[PDB]
Design an enzyme around this catalytic site. Structure first.
Site, PDB file in Angstrom:
ATOM      1  N   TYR A  94       1.069  -1.462  -0.159  1.00  0.00           N
ATOM      2  CA  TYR A  94       0.162   0.058  -0.196  1.00  0.00           C
ATOM      3  C   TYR A  94       0.670   1.612  -0.167  1.00  0.00           C
ATOM      4  O   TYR A  94       0.024   2.604  -0.560  1.00  0.00           O
ATOM      5  CB  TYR A  94      -1.377   0.134   0.867  1.00  0.00           C
ATOM      6  CG  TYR A  94      -2.247  -0.342   1.060  1.00  0.00           C
ATOM      7  CD1 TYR A  94      -2.338  -2.072   0.753  1.00  0.00           C
ATOM      8  CD2 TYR A  94      -3.440   0.080   0.349  1.00  0.00           C
ATOM      9  CE1 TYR A  94      -3.459  -2.790   0.398  1.00  0.00           C
ATOM     10  CE2 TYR A  94      -4.147  -1.017  -0.054  1.00  0.00           C
ATOM     11  CZ  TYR A  94      -4.528  -2.891  -0.226  1.00  0.00           C
ATOM     12  OH  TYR A  94      -5.766  -3.149  -0.715  1.00  0.00           O
ATOM     13  N   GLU A 136      -9.752  -6.863   3.301  1.00  0.00           N
ATOM     14  CA  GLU A 136      -8.960  -7.664   2.910  1.00  0.00           C
ATOM     15  C   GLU A 136      -8.100  -8.849   4.058  1.00  0.00           C
ATOM     16  O   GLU A 136      -8.142 -10.189   3.469  1.00  0.00           O
ATOM     17  CB  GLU A 136      -7.904  -7.140   1.978  1.00  0.00           C
ATOM     18  CG  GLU A 136      -8.072  -6.441   0.399  1.00  0.00           C
ATOM     19  CD  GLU A 136      -7.567  -5.335   0.230  1.00  0.00           C
ATOM     20  OE1 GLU A 136      -6.513  -5.539  -0.063  1.00  0.00           O
ATOM     21  OE2 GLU A 136      -8.032  -4.680  -1.194  1.00  0.00           O
ATOM     22  N   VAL A 283     -20.737 -15.923 -20.769  1.00  0.00           N
ATOM     23  CA  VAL A 283     -21.032 -17.759 -20.623  1.00  0.00           C
ATOM     24  C   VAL A 283     -21.295 -18.365 -18.909  1.00  0.00           C
ATOM     25  O   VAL A 283     -21.979 -19.432 -18.213  1.00  0.00           O
ATOM     26  CB  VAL A 283     -21.531 -18.329 -21.629  1.00  0.00           C
ATOM     27  CG1 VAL A 283     -19.928 -19.292 -21.336  1.00  0.00           C
ATOM     28  CG2 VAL A 283     -22.788 -19.386 -20.889  1.00  0.00           C
ATOM     29  N   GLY A 390     -13.446  -8.058 -17.104  1.00  0.00           N
ATOM     30  CA  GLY A 390     -12.379  -7.009 -16.627  1.00  0.00           C
ATOM     31  C   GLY A 390     -12.704  -6.105 -14.912  1.00  0.00           C
ATOM     32  O   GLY A 390     -13.922  -5.913 -14.393  1.00  0.00           O
TER      33      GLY A 390
HETATM   34  C1  LIG Z   1     -13.988 -11.325 -12.430  1.00  0.00           C
HETATM   35  C2  LIG Z   1     -13.151 -11.615 -13.724  1.00  0.00           C
HETATM   36  C3  LIG Z   1     -13.123 -13.249 -14.478  1.00  0.00           C
HETATM   37  C4  LIG Z   1     -12.682 -13.701 -15.482  1.00  0.00           C
HETATM   38  N1  LIG Z   1     -13.877 -14.961 -16.422  1.00  0.00           N
HETATM   39  C5  LIG Z   1     -13.073 -15.023 -17.455  1.00  0.00           C
HETATM   40  C6  LIG Z   1     -13.438 -16.298 -18.129  1.00  0.00           C
HETATM   41  O1  LIG Z   1     -13.796 -17.362 -17.381  1.00  0.00           O
HETATM   42  N2  LIG Z   1     -13.193 -16.368 -19.307  1.00  0.00           N
HETATM   43  C7  LIG Z   1     -12.103 -16.122 -20.208  1.00  0.00           C
HETATM   44  O2  LIG Z   1     -11.530 -16.521 -20.688  1.00  0.00           O
HETATM   45  N3  LIG Z   1     -11.853 -14.832 -19.321  1.00  0.00           N
HETATM   46  C8  LIG Z   1     -12.128 -14.127 -18.031  1.00  0.00           C
HETATM   47  N4  LIG Z   1     -11.671 -13.369 -17.349  1.00  0.00           N
HETATM   48  C9  LIG Z   1     -10.991 -11.862 -18.489  1.00  0.00           C
HETATM   49  C10 LIG Z   1      -9.288 -12.942 -17.802  1.00  0.00           C
HETATM   50  O3  LIG Z   1      -8.946 -13.152 -16.335  1.00  0.00           O
HETATM   51  C11 LIG Z   1      -8.358 -12.492 -18.725  1.00  0.00           C
HETATM   52  O4  LIG Z   1      -8.269 -10.886 -18.865  1.00  0.00           O
HETATM   53  C12 LIG Z   1      -8.329 -12.448 -20.389  1.00  0.00           C
HETATM   54  O5  LIG Z   1      -8.429 -14.603 -20.291  1.00  0.00           O
HETATM   55  C13 LIG Z   1      -7.287 -12.039 -21.278  1.00  0.00           C
HETATM   56  O6  LIG Z   1      -6.049 -12.158 -21.141  1.00  0.00           O
HETATM   57  P1  LIG Z   1      -4.682 -12.457 -21.518  1.00  0.00           P
HETATM   58  O7  LIG Z   1      -3.717 -12.353 -20.505  1.00  0.00           O
HETATM   59  O8  LIG Z   1      -5.331 -14.163 -22.594  1.00  0.00           O
HETATM   60  O9  LIG Z   1      -4.401 -11.257 -23.050  1.00  0.00           O
HETATM   61  P2  LIG Z   1      -3.589  -9.935 -22.370  1.00  0.00           P
HETATM   62  O10 LIG Z   1      -2.318  -9.933 -22.763  1.00  0.00           O
HETATM   63  O11 LIG Z   1      -4.173  -9.677 -20.729  1.00  0.00           O
HETATM   64  O12 LIG Z   1      -5.003  -9.020 -23.786  1.00  0.00           O
HETATM   65  C14 LIG Z   1      -6.119  -8.931 -24.014  1.00  0.00           C
HETATM   66  C15 LIG Z   1      -6.235  -8.465 -25.047  1.00  0.00           C
HETATM   67  O13 LIG Z   1      -5.723  -7.348 -25.514  1.00  0.00           O
HETATM   68  C16 LIG Z   1      -5.046  -7.795 -26.889  1.00  0.00           C
HETATM   69  N5  LIG Z   1      -4.112  -6.600 -27.482  1.00  0.00           N
HETATM   70  C17 LIG Z   1      -3.086  -6.892 -26.660  1.00  0.00           C
HETATM   71  N6  LIG Z   1      -2.072  -5.550 -26.360  1.00  0.00           N
HETATM   72  C18 LIG Z   1      -3.106  -4.783 -27.816  1.00  0.00           C
HETATM   73  C19 LIG Z   1      -2.440  -3.966 -28.072  1.00  0.00           C
HETATM   74  N7  LIG Z   1      -1.409  -2.841 -28.736  1.00  0.00           N
HETATM   75  N8  LIG Z   1      -3.434  -3.338 -28.851  1.00  0.00           N
HETATM   76  C20 LIG Z   1      -4.639  -3.665 -28.678  1.00  0.00           C
HETATM   77  N9  LIG Z   1      -4.875  -4.208 -28.237  1.00  0.00           N
HETATM   78  C21 LIG Z   1      -4.006  -5.847 -27.838  1.00  0.00           C
HETATM   79  C22 LIG Z   1      -5.399  -8.824 -26.686  1.00  0.00           C
HETATM   80  O14 LIG Z   1      -4.746  -9.349 -28.161  1.00  0.00           O
HETATM   81  C23 LIG Z   1      -6.286  -9.474 -25.616  1.00  0.00           C
HETATM   82  O15 LIG Z   1      -7.318  -9.966 -26.511  1.00  0.00           O
HETATM   83  C24 LIG Z   1     -12.380 -12.890 -16.199  1.00  0.00           C
HETATM   84  C25 LIG Z   1     -11.961 -11.062 -16.128  1.00  0.00           C
HETATM   85  C26 LIG Z   1     -12.864 -11.100 -14.467  1.00  0.00           C
HETATM   86  C27 LIG Z   1     -12.234  -9.298 -13.772  1.00  0.00           C
HETATM   87  C1  HEM Z   2      -6.685   2.252  -1.254  1.00  0.00           C
HETATM   88  C2  HEM Z   2      -5.723   1.670  -2.068  1.00  0.00           C
HETATM   89  C3  HEM Z   2      -6.041   0.652  -3.402  1.00  0.00           C
HETATM   90  C4  HEM Z   2      -7.108   1.101  -4.034  1.00  0.00           C
HETATM   91  C5  HEM Z   2      -7.737   2.703  -4.157  1.00  0.00           C
HETATM   92  C6  HEM Z   2      -7.112   0.765  -5.445  1.00  0.00           C
HETATM   93  C7  HEM Z   2      -7.914   0.640  -6.053  1.00  0.00           C
HETATM   94  C8  HEM Z   2      -7.993  -0.333  -7.282  1.00  0.00           C
HETATM   95  C9  HEM Z   2      -9.761  -0.699  -8.291  1.00  0.00           C
HETATM   96  C10 HEM Z   2     -10.638   0.668  -8.673  1.00  0.00           C
HETATM   97  C11 HEM Z   2      -9.518  -1.335  -8.876  1.00  0.00           C
HETATM   98  C12 HEM Z   2      -9.998  -2.162 -10.295  1.00  0.00           C
HETATM   99  C13 HEM Z   2     -10.965  -3.737 -10.108  1.00  0.00           C
HETATM  100  C14 HEM Z   2     -12.366  -3.548 -10.433  1.00  0.00           C
HETATM  101  O1  HEM Z   2     -12.915  -2.137 -11.031  1.00  0.00           O
HETATM  102  O2  HEM Z   2     -12.740  -4.576 -10.846  1.00  0.00           O
HETATM  103  C15 HEM Z   2      -8.260  -2.183  -8.603  1.00  0.00           C
HETATM  104  C16 HEM Z   2      -7.298  -3.559  -9.182  1.00  0.00           C
HETATM  105  C17 HEM Z   2      -6.418  -4.229  -8.681  1.00  0.00           C
HETATM  106  N1  HEM Z   2      -5.189  -3.240  -7.960  1.00  0.00           N
HETATM  107 FE1  HEM Z   2      -5.417  -1.752  -6.350  1.00  0.00          FE
HETATM  108  N2  HEM Z   2      -6.167  -0.854  -5.456  1.00  0.00           N
HETATM  109  C18 HEM Z   2      -5.771   0.082  -4.053  1.00  0.00           C
HETATM  110  C19 HEM Z   2      -4.296  -0.670  -3.655  1.00  0.00           C
HETATM  111  C20 HEM Z   2      -3.434  -1.228  -4.308  1.00  0.00           C
HETATM  112  C21 HEM Z   2      -2.215  -2.353  -4.168  1.00  0.00           C
HETATM  113  C22 HEM Z   2      -1.711  -1.482  -2.641  1.00  0.00           C
HETATM  114  C23 HEM Z   2      -2.099  -2.679  -5.268  1.00  0.00           C
HETATM  115  C24 HEM Z   2      -0.469  -3.349  -5.391  1.00  0.00           C
HETATM  116  C25 HEM Z   2       0.661  -2.808  -5.585  1.00  0.00           C
HETATM  117  C26 HEM Z   2      -2.458  -2.872  -5.760  1.00  0.00           C
HETATM  118  C27 HEM Z   2      -2.660  -3.468  -6.728  1.00  0.00           C
HETATM  119  C28 HEM Z   2      -4.393  -4.127  -7.643  1.00  0.00           C
HETATM  120  C29 HEM Z   2      -3.954  -5.280  -8.814  1.00  0.00           C
HETATM  121  C30 HEM Z   2      -2.388  -6.036  -9.183  1.00  0.00           C
HETATM  122  C31 HEM Z   2      -5.178  -5.072  -9.784  1.00  0.00           C
HETATM  123  C32 HEM Z   2      -6.042  -5.850 -10.991  1.00  0.00           C
HETATM  124  C33 HEM Z   2      -5.033  -5.060 -11.472  1.00  0.00           C
HETATM  125  C34 HEM Z   2      -5.779  -4.970 -13.193  1.00  0.00           C
HETATM  126  O3  HEM Z   2      -6.715  -6.456 -13.566  1.00  0.00           O
HETATM  127  O4  HEM Z   2      -5.791  -5.126 -14.205  1.00  0.00           O
HETATM  128  N3  HEM Z   2      -4.270  -2.446  -6.016  1.00  0.00           N
HETATM  129  N4  HEM Z   2      -7.417  -1.361  -7.387  1.00  0.00           N
END
Ligand SMILES: Cc1cc2nc3c(=O)[nH]c(=O)nc-3n(C[C@H](O)[C@H](O)[C@H](O)COP(=O)(O)OP(=O)(O)OC[C@H]3O[C@@H](n4cnc5c(N)ncnc54)[C@H](O)[C@@H]3O)c2cc1C
Ligand code: HEM
Ligand SMILES: O=N[O-]
Ligand SMILES: [K+]
EC number: 1.14.12.17
Length: 398
Positions: A94, A136, A283, A390
């Site tokens: 944090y 947490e 789905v 996302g």
């Molecule tokens: C709560 C939650 C539940 C989820 N559940 C599922 C699930 O059940 N099944 C599932 O398949 N996914 C799920 N996801 C999404 C999943 O976690 C991943 O984000 C997903 O698999 C994409 O990850 P990746 O590393 O393969 O792609 P990444 O490398 O993160 O890339 C993501 C997308 O961006 C594109 N991209 C990369 N670079 C660029 C760029 N330069 N410009 C434009 N586009 C770009 C990639 O081609 C890809 O399409 C979930 C997400 C959350 C938050």
């Molecule tokens: C008070 C402090 C913090 C706030 C307000 C905050 C807020 C958030 C929010 C809004 C998200 C996106 C979740 C969603 O919208 O579904 C997120 C995800 C995340 N947070 Fe934080 N966070 C805090 C502290 C931290 C710290 C200390 C870390 C680690 C150094 C951290 C790491 C991450 C990571 C790795 C994700 C996932 C990012 C992604 O999915 O792209 N957060 N947090």
């Protein structure tokens, strides 16, 4: 706490509301450029090209607008906390976030950020951070197992042309018993992988929803292949899981997380219908919920609305048909967007009841569109539950 502080915070609402995303973009760019070890935790893609900056900006804004009473935000704090907990974020992470947030605020506000304004934000950060750390800690206490644990991939099966369902069983000595794992449909697990393609140098963490609340024969989650389209790379972890992680290989998971869940008191009654509305791989947690609904009460009026590009990309076809065939009161509504219009307000008005318990899941854009329609159809907030694949905070009006 602190009365002059709170006015200072409130006086920055307009900048956060209009420029918040300049602040959060600067934040990510500086912190991750300067501190590349956090690239093992933060998903590079969500910040550079995704909605992560908007999620943070909205959260910082919500905190500033509710500085007199942050309790208002608890549902959002718990939602975010589940992701933090799944990702192994600890108290000692944090302070760096606070450093970089205050620095991004100073950089963007310019001469409009005196030491008093920065000091106040330091105080606000400390209070907000203390809340998250607290939530947490509880989630760490309730986690089904601690930290990353080793599972073996025991199956990989195509459930559509481009979606692979993974079956995983805990490695012996992980202390995890498949028969003693209460899953709530809607929860996701998180993988800790280190992809080897595309010159990757960092760990990569991703959430995947559980396909079933049944665990006796392994945990199941399904990954859509985010393939390479001329210009942009294939999705890193989906590619790694599809092409590189074989049956028999180990994969690391943290315990089930998330607040997406079917309303338990509504399962067993017939007056309030269930609507399960999905797009693409969204789905997956809805199949889990349909499974729970059908096993607990198959007489409940059910509306299965599932959108995909075409039939081959429509996931779990056989699975869903078999579950639906057990239900006495069901409407199955399949959309194929290769030919058919994107689900709109009139479609929803016509194909689903006015007063329903609605669960919807898919990409952030599909969620924004569907929430907009459901609100325009006057559904009450408390009967609409959704899970974007996302950052959910980028879908919330603060
Ligand atoms: C709560 C939650 C539940 C989820 N559940 C599922 C699930 O059940 N099944 C599932 O398949 N996914 C799920 N996801 C999404 C999943 O976690 C991943 O984000 C997903 O698999 C994409 O990850 P990746 O590393 O393969 O792609 P990444 O490398 O993160 O890339 C993501 C997308 O961006 C594109 N991209 C990369 N670079 C660029 C760029 N330069 N410009 C434009 N586009 C770009 C990639 O081609 C890809 O399409 C979930 C997400 C959350 C938050
Ligand atoms: C008070 C402090 C913090 C706030 C307000 C905050 C807020 C958030 C929010 C809004 C998200 C996106 C979740 C969603 O919208 O579904 C997120 C995800 C995340 N947070 Fe934080 N966070 C805090 C502290 C931290 C710290 C200390 C870390 C680690 C150094 C951290 C790491 C991450 C990571 C790795 C994700 C996932 C990012 C992604 O999915 O792209 N957060 N947090
Ligand atoms: O984006 N800090 O979670
Ligand atoms: K560092």
């Amino acid at each position: 706490l602190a009365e002059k502080t709170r006015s200072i915070i409130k006086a920055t609402v307009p900048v956060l509301e209009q420029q918040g995303t300049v602040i959060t973009r600067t934040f990510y760019k500086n912190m991750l450029t300067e501190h590349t070890e956090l690239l093992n935790i933060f998903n590079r893609t969500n910040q550079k090209v995704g909605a992560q900056p908007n999620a943070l900006a909205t959260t910082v804004l919500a905190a500033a607008k509710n500085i007199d009473d942050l309790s208002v935000l608890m549902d959002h704090v718990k939602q975010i906390g589940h992701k933090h907990r799944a990702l192994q974020i600890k108290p000692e992470h944090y302070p760096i976030v606070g450093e970089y947030l205050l620095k991004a605020i100073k950089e963007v506000l310019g001469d409009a950020a005196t030491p008093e304004i920065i000091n106040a934000w330091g105080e606000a950060y400390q209070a907000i951070a203390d809340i998250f750390i607290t939530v947490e800690k509880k989630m760490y206490e309730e986690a089904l197992w601690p930290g990353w644990k080793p599972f073996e991939i025991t199956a990989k099966e195509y459930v559509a042309s481009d979606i692979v369902e993974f079956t995983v069983k805990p490695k012996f000595g992980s202390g995890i018993e498949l028969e003693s794992l209460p899953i709530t449909p809607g929860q996701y697990i998180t993988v800790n992988t280190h992809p080897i393609r595309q010159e990757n140098q960092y760990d990569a963490l991703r959430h995947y929803s559980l396909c079933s609340a049944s665990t006796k024969n392994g945990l199941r989650f399904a990954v859509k292949m985010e393939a390479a389209r001329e210009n942009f790379p294939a999705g890193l972890v989906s590619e790694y899981l599809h092409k590189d992680a074989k049956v028999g290989d180990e994969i690391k998971l943290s315990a089930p997380a998330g607040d997406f869940a079917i309303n338990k008191e509504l399962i067993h009654q017939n007056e309030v219908p269930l609507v399960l509305l999905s797009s693409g791989v969204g789905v997956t947690p809805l199949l889990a919920m349909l499974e729970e609904q059908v096993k607990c009460n198959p007489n409940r009026p059910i509306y299965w609305i599932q959108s995909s590009y075409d039939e081959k990309t429509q996931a779990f076809k056989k699975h869903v048909d078999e579950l639906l065939a057990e239900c006495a009161n069901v409407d199955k509504i399949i959309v194929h967007t290769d030919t058919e219009p994107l689900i709109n307000a009139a479609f929803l008005k016509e194909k689903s009841p006015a007063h329903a318990d609605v669960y919807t899941c898919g990409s952030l854009a599909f969620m924004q569109a569907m929430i907009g329609h459901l609100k325009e159809l006057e559904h009450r907030d408390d009967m609409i539950h959704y899970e974007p694949f996302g950052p959910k905070m980028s879908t919330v009006q603060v």
